[PDB]
Paper text:
To capture the reaction at the post-polymerization state, we designed and applied the crystallization droplets containing dGTPαSe-Rp, DNA-II, and Pol X. Surprisingly, we found that in one asymmetric unit, there was one substrate complex and three product complexes, including two DNA duplexes with four enzyme molecules. In other words, in the unit cell, the phosphoryl transfer reaction took place in three product complexes, whereas the last one was trapped in a transition-like state, where the incoming dGTPαSe-Rp paired with 5′-dC of the template strand. In the substrate complex, though two Me2+ ions at the active center coordinated with the incoming dGTPαSe-Rp, the phosphoryl transfer reaction did not occur, indicated by the clear density gap between the primer 3′-OH and the substrate α-phosphorus. Interestingly, the unexpected transition-like state complex revealed the in-line attacking SN2 mechanism in the phosphoryl-transfer polymerization, where with the attacking of the 3′-OH on the α-P center, a new bond was formed and the pyrophosphate was left. To catalyze the reaction, two Me2+ ions coordinated with the 3′-OH and the incoming dGTPαSe-Rp, whereas MeA interacted with the 3′-OH and Se atom and brought them together for the bond formation. The distance (3.3 Å) between the 3′-OH and the α-P atom was shorter than the relaxed distance (4.1 Å) provided in the literature, indicating the readiness state of the nucleophile for attacking. On the basis of the local structure (the trigonal bipyramid-like geometry) and the transition-like state, the attacking 3′-OH formed the hydrogen bond with the substrate 5′-O (indicated by their 2.8 Å distance), which facilitated the 3′-OH attacking and the phosphodiester bond formation. When compared to the structure of the native product complex, the Se-modified product complex (formed from dGTPαSe-Rp) generated extra and strong electron density only for the Se atom on the P-center, revealing its Sp configuration and indicating the two-metal Se coordination.
Numbering used by the authors:
A (entry chain A), B (entry chain B): -1 to 174
Write the structure that this text describes.
Amino acid sequence: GGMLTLIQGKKIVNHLRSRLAFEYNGQLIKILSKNIVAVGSLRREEKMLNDVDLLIIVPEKKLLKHVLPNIRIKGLSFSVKVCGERKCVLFIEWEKKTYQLDLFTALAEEKPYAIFHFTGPVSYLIRIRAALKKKNYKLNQYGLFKNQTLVPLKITTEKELIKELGFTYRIPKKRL
Amino acid sequence: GGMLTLIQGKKIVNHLRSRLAFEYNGQLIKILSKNIVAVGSLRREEKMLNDVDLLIIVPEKKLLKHVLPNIRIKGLSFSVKVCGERKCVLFIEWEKKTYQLDLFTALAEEKPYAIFHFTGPVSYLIRIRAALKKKNYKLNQYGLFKNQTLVPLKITTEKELIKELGFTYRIPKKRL
DNA sequence: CGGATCC
DNA sequence: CGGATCC
Ligand SMILES: Nc1nc(=O)c2ncn([C@H]3C[C@H](O)[C@@H](CO[P@@](=O)([SeH])OP(=O)(O)O)O3)c2[nH]1
Ligand SMILES: [Mg+2]
Ligand SMILES: [Mg+2]
Ligand SMILES: [Mg+2]
Ligand SMILES: [Mg+2]
C-alpha cells in the first residue's frame, strides 16, 4: 500500500465512519461511528501516513469472533492481507490508488487501554512500559496488570488512565 | 494462493532449482540447486499442498540481509506478501493460477536443525519439543539449547540429529 | 513448541 | 514493551 497525506487519511476515515459493518450469522450489523476511533500516526497528526489505523469498540466478547473476520465496507474495493479477531489488515482502493487500512478491536472495558496503545508512538510506549515494569506492573492494550492479574482502575477515558498511571498527559501529536 | 497437487508442487520446485537468485549490491548471485531443500508438506509427500516450502542454505551470515529481501526468480511472475531475512512468502503465477511459495533461510551450521524444523509436521515438532523441554532443553530451527546456551552436537545430517536427540528416525512421510 | 514478521 | 497472526 502507498503513502498517504494527513488530509487523505482524514477523508478516508470520514468516508468509512458510516460504511463499516460485519456479517453475524447471515445478518449485516452496522458498526456505529461512536465505536470507531482513529488511532496510530493519523491521530498523532503526522503529515504523511504509512497507513490508516482504526480501532473498533466491540460491545460484547462473543462478537469478537465475528467482527473483523466478517468485516464489510459499503461501496469500497478492498482485499484482506491478514485477519483475525483482534487485527485485520486490508488493502483498499481509494481514488485509483491502493492504501493499507489497519483495523483493530477493543472491548468496552479495554477502550482507554486500547486507545493509549494504538495511539503510540512506539518509542513512547516502550519508555512508559519500561518504567511501569520496574514497579512490577505490565501495561498492554487490554489493561494494567500486576502478577498476571488485572488491576481494576476506576477510569473511563485515556486522559484518566495516563494520569492514574503516574505520567504527564500530552496530546497525541506531542507524545514521544 | 490456491491448492496444489504433489506432482504440481514437484514440477514447481524442479523449475525453481535453476532459476533462484538474489541481488547483492547490484550483482545477481545465483542460488545453487544443492543449497535448495524442499521442506514442509511437499517433503512429507502429502497428496495436496496448501503451498510450496523451500529452505535456502546461505553460506555466510553477512548474506542473510541480502538473500530473501532481494530474491529473484528468472522468468516467473510473483509478488511479495511478507519478507525478512529468515522468512519470505511469495505468491507466484504458474500456468493460469496463483500459488503460495514459502522461502526460508538457514546458515550451514543450522542446516540439520532447519531441515528437521521445516519438515514438520507441527504436531510432531510439538511432541518432540515438549519431551526435550522436560529435560531442560530447547530445540529450534537454529540449534539445541540448554540454559540459553548452544549445545554443540557433533552432527552433520538430519538423521544424525534425530538419533542424537534420543528419538526414532522416521522418513518425512511417516512423522506424526 | 518455538520463532518471524508485523502491529 | 507487549501482543497478533502466521510459519
Ligand atoms: N515449531 C513449529 N511451530 C509451528 O507452529 C509451525 N508451523 C509451521 N512450522 C514448520 C513446519 C512446517 O512443515 C513448515 C512449513 O509451514 P506450513 O504452515 Se507451509 O506447514 P506444512 O502444512 O506442513 O507445509 O514450517 C512450524 N514449526
Ligand atoms: Mg499507522
Ligand atoms: Mg497500521
Ligand atoms: Mg507448507
Ligand atoms: Mg509454507
